[PDB]
Amino acid sequence: MASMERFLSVYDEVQAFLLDQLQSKYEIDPNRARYLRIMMDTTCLGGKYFRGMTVVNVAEGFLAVTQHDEATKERILHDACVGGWMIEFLQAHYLVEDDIMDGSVMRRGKPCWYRFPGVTTQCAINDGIILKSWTQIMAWHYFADRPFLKDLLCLFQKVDYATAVGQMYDVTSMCDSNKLDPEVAQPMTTDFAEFTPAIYKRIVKYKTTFYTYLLPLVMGLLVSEAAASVEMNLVERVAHLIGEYFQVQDDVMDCFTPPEQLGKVGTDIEDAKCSWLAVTFLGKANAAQVAEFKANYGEKDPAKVAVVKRLYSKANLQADFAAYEAEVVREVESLIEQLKVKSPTFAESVAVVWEKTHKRKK
Amino acid sequence: MASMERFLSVYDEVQAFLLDQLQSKYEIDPNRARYLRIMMDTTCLGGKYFRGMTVVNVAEGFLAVTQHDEATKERILHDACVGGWMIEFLQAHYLVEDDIMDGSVMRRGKPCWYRFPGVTTQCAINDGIILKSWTQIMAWHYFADRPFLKDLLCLFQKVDYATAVGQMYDVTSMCDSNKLDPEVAQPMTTDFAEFTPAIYKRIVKYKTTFYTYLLPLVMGLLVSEAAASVEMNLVERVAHLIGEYFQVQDDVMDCFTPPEQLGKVGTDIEDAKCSWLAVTFLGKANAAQVAEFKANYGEKDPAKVAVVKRLYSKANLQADFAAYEAEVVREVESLIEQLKVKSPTFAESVAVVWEKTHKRKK
Ligand SMILES: C=C(C)CCOP(=O)(O)OP(=O)(O)O
Ligand SMILES: C=C(C)CCOP(=O)(O)OP(=O)(O)O
Ligand SMILES: C=C(C)CCOP(=O)(O)OP(=O)(O)O
Ligand SMILES: C=C(C)CCOP(=O)(O)OP(=O)(O)O
Ligand SMILES: [Mn+2]
Numbered sequence: 001m002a003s004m005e006r007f008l009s010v011y012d013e014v015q016a017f018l019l020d021q022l023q024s025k026y027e028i029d030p031n032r033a034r035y036l037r038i039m040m041d042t043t044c045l046g047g048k049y050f051r052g053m054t055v056v057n058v059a060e061g062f063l064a065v066t067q068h069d070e071a072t073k074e075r076i077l078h079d080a081c082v083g084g085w086m087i088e089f090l091q092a093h094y095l096v097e098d099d100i101m102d103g104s105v106m107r108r109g110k111p112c113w114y115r116f117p118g119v120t121t122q123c124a125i126n127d128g129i130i131l132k133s134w135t136q137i138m139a140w141h142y143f144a145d146r147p148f149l150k151d152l153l154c155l156f157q158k159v160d161y162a163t164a165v166g167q168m169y170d171v172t173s174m175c176d177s178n179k180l181d182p183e184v185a186q187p188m189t190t191d192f193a194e195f196t197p198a199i200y201k202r203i204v205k206y207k208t209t210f211y212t213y214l215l216p217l218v219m220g221l222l223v224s225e226a227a228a229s230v231e232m233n234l235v236e237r238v239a240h241l242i243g244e245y246f247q248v249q250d251d252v253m254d255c256f257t258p259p260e261q262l263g264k265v266g267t268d269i270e271d272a273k274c275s276w277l278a279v280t281f282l283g284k285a286n287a288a289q290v291a292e293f294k295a296n297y298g299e300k301d302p303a304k305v306a307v308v309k310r311l312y313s314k315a316n317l318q319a320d321f322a323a324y325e326a327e328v329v330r331e332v333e334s335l336i337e338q339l340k341v342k343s344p345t346f347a348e349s350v351a352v353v354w355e356k357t358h359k360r361k362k
Numbered sequence: 363m364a365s366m367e368r369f370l371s372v373y374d375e376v377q378a379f380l381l382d383q384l385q386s387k388y389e390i391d392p393n394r395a396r397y398l399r400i401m402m403d404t405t406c407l408g409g410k411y412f413r414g415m416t417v418v419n420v421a422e423g424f425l426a427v428t429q430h431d432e433a434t435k436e437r438i439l440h441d442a443c444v445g446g447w448m449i450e451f452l453q454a455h456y457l458v459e460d461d462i463m464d465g466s467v468m469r470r471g472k473p474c475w476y477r478f479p480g481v482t483t484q485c486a487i488n489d490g491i492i493l494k495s496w497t498q499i500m501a502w503h504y505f506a507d508r509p510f511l512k513d514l515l516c517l518f519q520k521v522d523y524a525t526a527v528g529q530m531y532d533v534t535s536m537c538d539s540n541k542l543d544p545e546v547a548q549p550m551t552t553d554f555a556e557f558t559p560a561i562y563k564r565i566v567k568y569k570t571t572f573y574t575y576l577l578p579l580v581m582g583l584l585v586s587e588a589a590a591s592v593e594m595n596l597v598e599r600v601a602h603l604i605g606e607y608f609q610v611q612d613d614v615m616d617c618f619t620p621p622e623q624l625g626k627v628g629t630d631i632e633d634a635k636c637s638w639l640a641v642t643f644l645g646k647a648n649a650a651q652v653a654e655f656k657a658n659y660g661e662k663d664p665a666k667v668a669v670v671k672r673l674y675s676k677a678n679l680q681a682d683f684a685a686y687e688a689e690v691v692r693e694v695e696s697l698i699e700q701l702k703v704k705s706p707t708f709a710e711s712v713a714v715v716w717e718k719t720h721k722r723k724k
């Protein structure tokens with residue numbers, strides 16, 4: 001177990017705690033409390049909950065093989081649920097600001113938060129900042145007396161920082177590094193020389209993999225008091241690997257999955273992003289295809305966007321994706337086997353996370 | 363002490379630490395390091411440094427009367443400087459996002475960060491988020507082994523949260539509370555019924571007073587290991603009082619101090635903000651002046667803005683400001699006298715902070 005039901009139930013508790021505290025300590029009025037309730041629901045719910053449920057499933061794995069009083073088992077499961085919501089609220093923060101930064105129109109099948117009629121960008125920027133503050137309010141309330149509090153806060157903040165650095169790498173990925181200058185308007189690259197696997201990998205490593213895979217796996221270990229029982233270098237390597245594959249999927253779906261299924265409308269082509277599709281197309285294309293790509297990439301013009309998507313389709317990128325995927329399967333399986341040496345239970349949790357990631361269709 | 367020189371010197375050290383870590387741990391390239399260096403300098407420097415120097419001056423007060431080895435004195439002064447930069451970087455974060463939210467054009471005598479040619483709003487939103495992450499990176503690096511670390515992080519996060527709540531109160535201050543609704547476009551108030559002292563005071567309490575006065579005073583106590591030696595209810599009361607007066611000054615200057623001296627261009631009238639000027643004018647005006655105010659407030663139109671400023675000038679608000687100020691002087695002096703009972707040294711630091719605030723011209 002009922003993991004998803006327990007996790008969703010704890011959302012109601014955290015929300016009530018936060019909103020009750022706003023009334024009792026922060027002098028909030030009922031209508032602004034309602035606004036923040038709706039904001040919380042809209043930005044924190046309706047996703048796949050993969051990050052939060054990873055914390056829960058890692059914790060459940062150790063519960064199955066560790067001797068505990070039932071009260072202790074309930075405490076660990078509750079801590080796992082609260083920690084998972086910390087990551088889901090961190091996600092909510094990033095998506096609110098990212099949708100503004102990327103000029104997006106839909107998220108989770110609804111308008112992006114900033115596009116809601118009674119929201120607008122000026123309030124949505126601050127709403128996003130509130131979401132991140134709530135992660136810390138949660139931590140200090142629910143975990144005040146826990147032995148893992150310091151480790152958890154330190155990990156959370158380093159992951160949050162890495163993600164913000166990665167967002168800088170992402171939103172500057174269509175500029176030439178040598179021309180970056182706050183004082184000079186930034187032209188889009190014309191040579192696309194920095195659309196390389198290594199540079200792509202750096203964006204993804206920081207913007208996605210720490211908070212989507214490393215943070216939930218290690219938080220599950222922390223609330224289980226089990227971190228010392230795994231090889232942390234393997235956790236870092238497998239989180240980076242699965243997290244990169246997760247983003248490659250997201251890049252592919254941005255272009256080729258209908259918004260009806262995906263729940264968002266892709267902007268990577270029009271935004272000139274350094275996506276897996278663009279890097280891989282450039283790793284394959286002949287001279288004429290590169291020049292045609294350059295003539296059309298990074299423009300909102302729906303007909304130029306359409307030229308790019310046809311170039312992608314005719315370049316048979318499904319072949320590159322399959323070879324990349326087959327390589328990731330080898331390496332993920334190898335790392336899971338290595339994890340089994342010290343931590344069979346955690347290895348299985350990583351196998352579950354991989355299976356969920358590998359099979360996802362949104 | 364040479365307090366200002368020590369404090370500015372520590373900026374260079376923190377900056378080098380942060381940028382060196384970006385190179386050694388976060389795979390940053392030189393041009394993006396340069397961008398973030400310039401971003402740090404532009405957003406963190408050039409203010410009055412009142413918040414950071416409050417930490418230093420509180421710590422210096424206890425140094426003068428406490429027995430310490432010189433090495434311990436140097437450690438406390440360095441911690442005070444690092445903690446002061448934590449608050450200055452928090453300030454930097456708020457100003458970067460606030461200038462976007464308020465549609466402002468100038469800050470500290472230069473263009474707002476988001477208006478720099480090679481910046482733009484999409485990167486500036488994330489740059490602001492980086493500034494806040496840097497406050498935590500600082501804390502965990504410099505204070506990892508300090509006994510005050512947990513208290514400091516908990517205080518910092520609660521203050522940061524209060525400020526974000528206050529920014530919500532601020533950016534929604536021109537809407538009718540009963541009509542707030544994320545799903546419905548928000549009309550500006552027509553009755554201005556929520557332009558009251560009590561509602562004004564709530565905005566200011568949260569958006570300004572916690573991070574501008576409470577946080578620097580208590581951080582000075584924490585790095586001095588002296589918090590138990592003061593009456594914290596008095597610290598809270600005097601921080602709220604001086605912080606409110608500080609914002610009333612800022613509201614007055616928004617309208618009446620030339621940008622050449624102030625270093626920013628006011629937006630409160632055009633933004634329909636609940637400012638001290640608007641609340642006090644409405645506390646004084648006759649029927650015709652209220653209707654003329656309503657006809658002109660909250661519009662970028664330079665001639666409508668000019669109508670409001672003339673209404674302010676003819677309403678003799680200098681009289682209300684002087685009575686308000688005379689009341690604050692009574693109450694601040696009373697709280698300083700009360701603080702002397704347990705903590706003469708801290709009372710004097712608060713007297714210094716008050717004098718600096720009271721005499722400021724920007
Ligand atoms: C890192 C990326 C690509 C952001 C979207 O993440 P998810 O696809 O996990 O979004 P939700 O399930 O939370 O909606
Ligand atoms: C949001 C973060 C931090 C990483 C994912 O970036 P994207 O910008 O690719 O995410 P989507 O908008 O595609 O979900
Ligand atoms: C709280 C307000 C009114 C923001 C500006 O603060 P300051 O007037 O202290 O700005 P700097 O000295 O840091 O430039
Ligand atoms: C920035 C914060 C959090 C409070 C001061 O608000 P203002 O919006 O009045 O500040 P200025 O732009 O006048 O400096
Ligand atoms: Mn996006």
Ligand SMILES: [Mn+2]
Nearest residue numbers: 098101102170
């Ligand atoms: Mn993005």
Ligand SMILES: [Mn+2]
Nearest residue numbers: 250251254268
């Ligand atoms: Mn995407």
Ligand SMILES: [Mn+2]
Nearest residue numbers: 460461464466
């Ligand atoms: Mn402002």
Ligand SMILES: [Mn+2]
Nearest residue numbers: 460463464532
């Ligand atoms: Mn403002």
Ligand SMILES: [Mn+2]
Nearest residue numbers: 612613616630
């Ligand atoms: Mn102001």
